[PDB]
Amino acid sequence: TSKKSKEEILELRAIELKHGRVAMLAVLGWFHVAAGFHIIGDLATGTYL
């Protein structure tokens, strides 16, 4: 960011925040499904995923 302009810095922060939020939700869902608790898939496939 040393040579970037303000718009580029704001876009970098937007990318960072989108990735961070997606990653937080991803970890939540990953642990949720790794604990079992995967009902949508269970019901859709008729079997325990």
């Binding site: 079992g36 608790f37 009902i39 269970d42 019901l43 325990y48």
Partner: protein, 56 residues
């Protein structure tokens, strides 16, 4: 009157049914009878304490 009610009884026996014929399954219990697993109500992550056998 005896003949009248004899004819009435004949007509009753011919045209009337004891029961509507509803499926017996709707009368059988589901919970507490030991046959819970048949209905697959709690299949995802089933409760271990409930016996797996469906014999009742």
């Amino acid at each position: 009157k005896e003949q009248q009610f004899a004819w009435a009884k004949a007509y009753y026996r011919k045209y009337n049914q004891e029961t509507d014929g509803k499926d017996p399954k709707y009368s059988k219990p589901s919970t507490g009878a030991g046959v819970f697993r048949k209905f697959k109500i709690d299949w995802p992550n089933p409760d271990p304490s409930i016996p797996d056998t469906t014999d009742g």
